Structure 1
């Protein structure tokens, strides 16, 4: 049983489409337990100045009961069967999923459909959640990492839709109407823009059947079955600096525009990020870590942590890094960081990519560790690539990557580009934009 063989013997992912336009996909295994959910192509990016944070507001009511069954009833029924109900809303994607015994795959599918189609939107529950959401905005405001990434999007995509945060504005949350949420749901939670995904011990045909039974309400016009292409979001080389020397450590995020889901180069960018890696003060490896940047961080105590990232989207994306450091080590950290980025475009080695490729393989395999994560892969893949991509395909693609390819792709997206910068906390030591911009060439 070799790695190759195990990859080929993995059960295939089955997909079928209903007449209403909804897609049903699932990967079958022999597990008494399973996860099934509906991945919707909706998010803050689809909102606008007036209904920003509606998709989030909805995510708060999607579990407070439907028309067929009020709050208590809905909750009791789900709880009493040992099932877990979770979900989330991002900028371009939303999801509501359930974990339970394969023995209930069908009852669950009915529950899901009831959630996405007949949300009660209890007028009173809405005012109750209005205050809850307002408390979460103050909680999240202390999450420097997330405040920093929000700011990164706020400036990198300023003037556009991707500039808004998922949770939305205070004004919006204070004034969103029962009608707005309703409108949101109707406008976005639509069959062709959704995906019923399930993984575990489930019958694809039994899944698709319960699907036909509950996911119905077909469309008449053509405007109801077309998936609206979103207007492009302009990337802008710039920086937003939120200074507060009262904060203990500083967060910094730098990034360049990325390609977008469908682009093959993403396989290389991920290998690239694998070379630089990530780090945090609890990595036993210490000064021996393969990641050069990580090694330097340890030697010179450059930061508390740092991480690379390649955040994709339909038509764009953010490729960069983020670090947390003491006010007095920001400059050296940024220096070494930008240094490693130059090394990438200019002097990557075969040994380097070899390691990074391996690291990347076990990374993709790790994202399929359980029913929920695999179910998440399916929902996302069909929603982003319009098809599931096997580990064997990925591996096929990953294997083709070499040093030269890394240098060329990185040079393409990084070298001499104007980055987007977001800095929060005690950032006096972080040099100006011009100096950082110069770190973008020669290495």
Structure 2
């Protein structure tokens, strides 16, 4: 069929509210599965100065023991019922989810609610997890990419606590004390900030009743404040590295604007080309044809990060140290061509690719359940596919060049360079070439 008939058949994301600050979201579907997750909006953005990254310390210390159900017994029961327990964390949020079958849901809500409300600290285990965090900072200095992105956030938001790093300094790691971590647990992870999601071929009312059972008596009853986008530069001269990693970003809109929808169309236009794609020369985006014809970059991802009505909008390119300035110039030329001489065919192609990418995204257990999570983080609801289809159809080329002139033209970026990056010119060259004076 077509868009109306297919987009009409989509489940409504049956929401409900548990009456202490809990938002529960079920998506009854037609496949035999369940994915059950707890999202608590707790990251470095909510954190203080002298407890930078203690939520990461929590998501290490979370599974290793509670007051009613022990830690080895926890993962033992996970392996007993055939589940897939998993957890992650941003600078703002925190997620603990379980991939299982829907009959394993009562044991799931059991163990996961004990994880929510009755965690603990074990001092020998806390020294062992301190050593684990040291070893993992050691083994995650290796991959250059999130080093570049943490580096980029730290130079983009200077002085403000929004660029508190994800794991703090090392001396901060070796002094996150027991009383301060229990204080962190008592302050943050409790009432107003939690979404309990359940996606699959499941039921709403029985899960509602058993969540009313397990979340009985939370007793939880000033944060999330804005910050400054400075705009700056940092360069790591380190010539013992094989390739060059350079990212540049401007201030992004956030969540609650159609500007974010127009910039999602723009980041569908530009994207992330990666070099190992089958065929490189004849790609539709002219940036792709140029950067492959002159063989400049090794990759580039050109994208948007949306924090709570704030955030970043930008690009990271990986290239050899002889193709920095040409890559930089053609990237700026693509941005200013979207600004000043925005045509129609590029908006058509960006809308086709953004529709196809979002439809191919919203499938499977983990992406749809994380869509439920990241929807109910700030939206106050979950947005279905039809409303994003409408807000894609509501933008023509004129609004696209309005948004690009609104955000990109003649700005103060944030540049993070990493590696053999000597050929990158000085910052005022990027400033005076960032806006077109028509060369």
When normalised by structure 1's length, the TM-score is: 0.96
Deviations 1:283-333 (A, max 9, x none): 113111112212111011111000111100013110000000111111111
Aligned ranges 1:362-401 → 2 under 5 Å: 362-401=356-395
For 1:156 and 1:337, the matched residues in 2 are separated by 20
- 1:335 equivalent in alignment to 2:304: no
The structural deviation recorded for 1:206 is 1.6
Contact 2:249 2:414 in 1 (8 A): yes
Contact 1:13 1:25 in 2 (8 A): yes
The total of aligned residue pairs comes to 437
For 2:162 and 2:31, the matched residues in 1 are separated by 39
Question: In structure 2, which of residues 399, 409, 418 is the aligned counterpart of residue 405 of structure 1?
Answer: 399
Deviations 1:352-400 (A, max 9, x none): 1111111111221222221121111111111121110010000100111
Q: Which residue pairs with 1:238 in the alignment? A: 232
Aligned ranges 1:129-278 → 2 under 5 Å: 129-219=129-219, 224-225=220-221, 228-278=222-272
Q: Which residue pairs with 1:438 in the alignment? A: 432
Q: Which residue pairs with 1:421 in the alignment? A: 415
The structural deviation recorded for 1:404 is 1.1
Q: Which residue pairs with 1:44 in the alignment? A: 44
SS at match of 1:333: helix
Q: Which residue pairs with 1:321 in the alignment? A: 315
For 1:197 and 1:328, the matched residues in 2 are separated by 49
Contact 2:46 2:223 in 1 (8 A): no
For 2:326 and 2:409, the matched residues in 1 are separated by 20
Contact 1:276 1:292 in 2 (8 A): no
The structural deviation recorded for 1:38 is 0.5
Q: Which residue pairs with 1:90 in the alignment? A: 90
Contact 2:69 2:114 in 1 (8 A): no
SS at match of 2:151: helix
The structural deviation recorded for 1:185 is 1.7
For 1:280 and 1:151, the matched residues in 2 are separated by 22
When normalised by structure 2's length, the TM-score is: 0.97
The structural deviation recorded for 1:134 is 0.9
For 2:124 and 2:256, the matched residues in 1 are separated by 43
Aligned ranges 1:49-64 → 2 under 5 Å: 49-64=49-64
- 1:291 equivalent in alignment to 2:285: yes
For 1:20 and 1:71, the matched residues in 2 are separated by 27
Contact 1:259 1:265 in 2 (8 A): yes
Q: Which residue pairs with 1:66 in the alignment? A: 66
Tell me, which stretches of 5 or more residues in structure 2 are unaligned?
none
Contact 1:53 1:169 in 2 (8 A): no
For 2:52 and 2:208, the matched residues in 1 are separated by 34
Q: Which residue pairs with 2:276 in the alignment? A: 282
The structural deviation recorded for 1:25 is 0.4
For 1:145 and 1:194, the matched residues in 2 are separated by 30
Note the aligned Cα RMSD (angstroms).
1.3
For 1:111 and 1:2, the matched residues in 2 are separated by 44
Deviations 1:253-298 (A, max 9, x none): 1010011111221000010011112211111131111122121110
The structural deviation recorded for 1:89 is 1.1
Deviations 1:116-139 (A, max 9, x none): 211232222111110111111122
For 1:368 and 1:181, the matched residues in 2 are separated by 37
Tell me, which stretches of 5 or more residues in structure 1 are unaligned?
none
